[model samples]
Target: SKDIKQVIEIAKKHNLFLKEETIQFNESGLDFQAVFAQDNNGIDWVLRLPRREDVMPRTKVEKQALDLVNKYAISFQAPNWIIYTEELIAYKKLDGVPAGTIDHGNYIWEIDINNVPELFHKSLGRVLAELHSIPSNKAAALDLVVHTPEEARMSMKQRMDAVRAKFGVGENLWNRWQAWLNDDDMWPKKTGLIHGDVHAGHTMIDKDANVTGLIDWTEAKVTDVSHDFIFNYRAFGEEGLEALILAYKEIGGYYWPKMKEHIIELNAAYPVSIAEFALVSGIEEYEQMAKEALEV
Candidate 1:
């Protein structure tokens, strides 16, 4: 259902006791359409309906990751998908407002990344470090993709070549990505669970601007842990990234000698991901986004 009328109707078909007037619809998310509705019992829930037919595996993986992560003693809350169905995925509403909300193709935020307080960075950094520390075996047990450092490098290599073959990546970006992929010193030896898409939009924050939780686990995976830092660079820029890194390292999170440099390369090469998704999606708008990302 794309609107409240349809969602409210669908809710009843599923035997839900939803209070129809309380429903709020949000179509701003990239992967899923969202609806926030309250039950007759006064409980709040978020319903995420997938946007595409091909997201079955992604949905399953997200569920698995959430269930597994929830079992661990982490400092923050993650969605506990109480109901999982092909038509709808519903979970109780976790507290706090989103640090940033993606609305009408732009990410709107209250806190300034450049002026982020130390507590905010520390809270986010600590949670990220905790997530990255999850044992590979645990994730592997759930059949999550566990990539070795070499495998991670190879995957990016394949993506770069594929994008280059079809869209012809710019020479400057091509060479930089190639060098980054070939740099043994930059790759982390230990592979860990990474949230993959860690941006302000997925992050949840309280009134104090401290990170309370993270949502959207569709891109979660076991790979080079530094992949998690790229969006922070895009969202927070250089000095902010340094502050986050300091907080992460102080919390005993894994760090490599060349992690900062590595993340910079990853940041520059991010267009490859958008390009890959664009090619797979066959959406003209996303293809244009990829083109812009590549040329600039």
Candidate 2:
């Protein structure tokens, strides 16, 4: 492909070793895609190109998160960040095809049904437990976006403060968000590192369908560990969810009594996450999800 020839030239311009034969490119990412190649020393790397309004800021946050995750990866695999800059972000290419890919050629997040092969769900549960066990303070320790549950809860309240003012026409659409903001018990008590977008599509797996690693560290956040697991309920129905819950417990992850309750508020907070964009820019991406939330 023409892009491959151009990618080699780009590498030469940057003084990095890349052979035309060793380069691979794919649009596996939902919001972005990457160029993959190996240096002359036979070390693999990826050039991550993300499409978002604030690309560099997002790039930098992900770089820091990967750098931290790479340090304590004795149990599970994560990317080793190579460079972080506005022009390009580079990291070592991780092993394996993303789960739901090799078998079905479908991406994990794009998996449509509540029911999946049991082992796929089991591997997912174990891998998430492995990731959520990391201490969240690492984000602050490394100077990334940092917020406690109290601060994050108040942060939600502060946004609702402005939003409620703007929509003063007697509509109670804003009320659900306010209740989500005010419920302290709905907020998670313990915080930890999380692949903030932990939907299954973000995971990688081997030909055998075992979880090998996770990709796209962009949304990794120092937040409620429960924040990461809420997708379990969405992706897997009650039976599949219980399978995940049981699988996670078997792997030694601690249980949270308030899990389902927190899931309720977290689901509500989904709209608040992008309400600003919906209010101001009205981008198609933001509006669609916000519209779905209101249907709740």
Candidate 3:
């Protein structure tokens, strides 16, 4: 599955023209594997291939969303997908390297976290605020899926129910989730486009440590804007998280006094996220993560 030859063969089968000599395997992500290649014109491209049948629908939507993102002056770079099909998507690769990549489920930093510039933190907040500011009507016009606050709550409830039915959600965690779900004050009233997976791994940065771009929009969707900040807290502790929050609000981001608390709650509910994916992918490693999160 990690072979460049196999990717080349798949590209051929999909009629995604590519130069075999230029193609190089990037990484095999949980839902997608990527290859970095260059076109005849010498333009670098990143080709992403779905790793499973189930993620195809989301992949398709991300293609549409990228089309929308490319047209906006969102203060940072985003992939401009040039070719897409159900089988693969090829986009002009953006500048900068991923802040890190995942290895054995652990984040391997490609840049010094301690040395991350303050400008990068502010830019991260700015980009997030910009994404959340993308009007709901604009997203709706594209036929993108939208989830209202109530609907988002219901969706999480259903995921919790599914996980509980299939696995033991320890009493403490279950209660914690229950408290959060019922806490009306903690939920965001505004819904907007979000980067769904906002983390160090998906963050791209330049040598100066400024955030250059965001990649891997496979989970991009219209949902609670607060959904974008959980991993920021995880990647950078409270101080860094606060810097982002301050800059985000400074840029006219939607906010309430309890938004930070909500982000914290959602971070704690990370186990439910792993459990939800485990339910679908049935990957034992993810299931173990879910179990450990719940049991802890």
Best by lDDT: 1
C-alpha RMSD of each candidate structure in angstroms: 2.6, 4.6, 3.2
lDDT string for model 3 (3-83, tens) is 767777766775566677888876677767788887666778888887777555666677766766776646788888666
Off by over 4 Å in 3: 1-21, 27-32, 49-58, 86-88, 139-143
Tens digit of lDDT per residue, candidate 1, span 22-123? 998886466778889999999988988767676666677777778777877378889998777677778889888887877667778878755776777888
lDDT by candidate, in order shown: 0.81, 0.66, 0.78
Candidate 3, clashing residue pairs? Answer: none
What TM value does model 2 have? Answer: 0.75
lDDT ranking, high to low: 1, 3, 2
For model 2, residues 23-70, the per-residue Cα lDDT tens digits are 887764644568888988898888765545567655667777777777
Per-model TM-score versus the true fold: 0.90, 0.75, 0.86
